[PDB]
Design a protein around this ligand. Structure first.
Ligand SMILES: CCCCCCCCCCCCCCCCCC(=O)OC[C@H](CO[C@@H]1O[C@H](CO)[C@H](O)[C@H](O)[C@H]1O)OC(=O)CCCCCCCCCCCCCCCCC
Ligand SMILES: CC(C)CCC[C@@H](C)[C@H]1CC[C@H]2[C@@H]3CC=C4C[C@@H](OC(=O)CCC(=O)O)CC[C@]4(C)[C@H]3CC[C@]12C
Lengths: 390, 42
């Protein structure tokens, strides 16, 4: 961790300065997250049908309510009513997508594996996502959490060195890639950068990345999104025209991607969480316990998202079901207390994420704003040009 | 003339093989699809 041994005063002033509640101390090296699976009571792993049907039915009810309203008042309503129904539908679908993510890791209904596979496929299709590819990318993420140059399926930060290289190649700060980075990680559109993730799935639609023994399974995975976008996105358009498309599909889609992106970005990024390269001090347990941030929401939001913010517990006990994630956290907070980091979703946090922590420099091993960093490295460009005198 | 083929060993093998292959089509390229289904977590 970045803030090593130091009294509670500087910890807490950093905490309320950045919007976190409890910052974290320092974890010993040489460990593994799967260790602390022994700190969990065995009753947490039990299956019950009540929570299952509740988790699959609450977000469905929210979605149905939003749609019934929106169709009852199709296009006679002003823009704010449309925005509110879109937000409701997007959140309901984020809940159903958390259920599908559970079925992808094989921990929702293990007794009926065919049924849980079919359910995950069905719930993932409307977001145009593939279930087998999702499983693969998530496993690869769990194996490489916070590893520099390797965690490509997470919010890999834009480092100073690659930026300097691109600026030396561009011959100035006016190129195309320059302005692209400029607007993507300086404006609120960052809270939607998850859409980039969506495009990096479909690994070129290239069966040459996978193991041959799995071709038929991967192909099938790609055919459920396509079939949707080939049989249902026509109907919608044909039955509502452009407007009946932008209000019935595109706005809930953008809301869902907001949820996905903000959840992940807040989860694994903070000024006191370093990104060590491989061989240079990367530790697995240290990165999965100390390098994680838990977001706290109002309980209505939580029960709508199926506890989608609680990510730390299911990284130490990958078989821990979804409805036991809150309780389990309370257990770990007792024993791993001094090391965890926590935050509450507020405006200050997102403003800091957008305006302050933009570039990651490894020498200082911290995040710094894009503009001051680029003008500093450009002044050093001028000074090496002066050093290039002869 | 004919070279007394029936007491030979290369000709007996080639004879039997050619007849068996000429009987009926023996290529099964579509049965190999099972080799692309060995990993499926369903
Ligand atoms: C819902 C809850 C579901 C439960 C599941 C939760 C599991 C959480 C895992 C989700 C992981 C999400 C990762 C998000 C992520 O990768 O994105 C974060 C990634 C950033 O990530 C880095 O991106 C870099 C860009 O090339 C490189 O690809 C790096 O490898 C990549 O790590 O987003 C991007 O790719 C940003 C660039 C794309 C530009 C965005 C396009 C914006 C278009 C505007 C959209 C319209 C707006 C109106
Ligand atoms: C059109 C709307 C209403 C329905 C949704 C369509 C999607 C299913 C399409 C449109 C955008 C497509 C993607 C656009 C970009 C690419 C990259 C492209 O591959 C490459 O560019 C390879 C690398 C290279 O060319 O250098 C093909 C796959 C993929 C992910 C495409 C997969 C299919 C996608 C997601």
């Amino acid at each position: 961790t970045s803030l090593d041994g130091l009294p509670e005063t500087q910890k807490y002033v950093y905490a309320d300065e950045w919007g976190f509640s409890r910052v974290g101390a320092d974890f010993p090296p040489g460990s593994h997250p799967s260790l602390f699976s022994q700190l969990l009571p065995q009753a947490l792993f039990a299956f019950d049908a009540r929570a299952a049907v509740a988790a699959v039915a609450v977000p469905l009810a929210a979605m149905a309510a939003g749609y019934g309203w929106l169709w009852y008042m199709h296009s006679i309503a002003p823009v704010w009513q449309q925005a509110l129904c879109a937000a409701l539908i997007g959140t309901g679908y984020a809940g159903l997508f958390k259920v599908a993510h559970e079925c992808a890791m094989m921990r929702f209904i293990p007794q009926m594996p065919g049924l849980q596979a079919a359910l995950g496929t069905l719930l993932m299709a409307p977001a145009l996502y593939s279930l087998p590819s999702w499983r693969l990318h998530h496993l690869h993420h769990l194996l490489h959490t916070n590893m520099l140059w390797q965690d490509v399926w997470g919010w890999h930060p834009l480092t100073k060195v690659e930026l300097a290289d691109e600026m030396v190649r561009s011959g100035g700060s006016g190129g195309a890639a320059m302005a692209a980075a400029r607007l993507v990680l300086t404006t609120p559109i960052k809270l939607f950068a998850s859409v980039g993730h969506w495009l990096r799935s479909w690994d070129g639609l290239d069966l040459r990345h996978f193991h041959p023994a799995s071709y038929v399974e991967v192909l099938s995975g790609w055919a459920a999104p396509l079939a949707f976008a080939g049989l249902v996105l026509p109907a919608v358009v044909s039955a509502g025209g452009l407007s009946g498309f932008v209000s019935c599909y595109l706005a809930p889609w953008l809301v869902f991607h907001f949820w996905l992106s903000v959840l992940s970005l807040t989860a694994h990024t903070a000024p006191h969480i370093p990104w060590r390269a491989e061989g240079d001090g990367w530790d697995a347990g240290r990165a999965a316990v100390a390098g994680t941030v838990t977001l706290r929401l109002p309980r209505p939001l939580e029960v709508l998202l199926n506890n989608a913010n609680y990510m730390l517990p299911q990284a130490v006990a990958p078989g821990l079901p979804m409805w036991s994630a809150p309780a389990a956290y309370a257990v770990l907070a007792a024993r791993l207390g001094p090391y965890l980091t926590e935050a509450s979703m507020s405006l200050k946090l997102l403003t800091n994420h957008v305006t302050r922590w933009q570039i990651y420099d490894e020498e200082a091993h911290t995040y710094r704003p894009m503009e001051e960093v680029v003008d500093e490295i450009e002044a050093d460009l001028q000074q090496l040009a002066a050093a290039a005198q002869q | 003339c004919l070279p007394n083929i029936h007491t030979s060993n290369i000709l007996n093998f080639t004879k039997n093989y050619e007849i068996f292959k000429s009987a009926k089509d023996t290529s099964n390229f579509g049965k190999k699809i099972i080799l692309n289904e060995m990993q499926n977590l369903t």
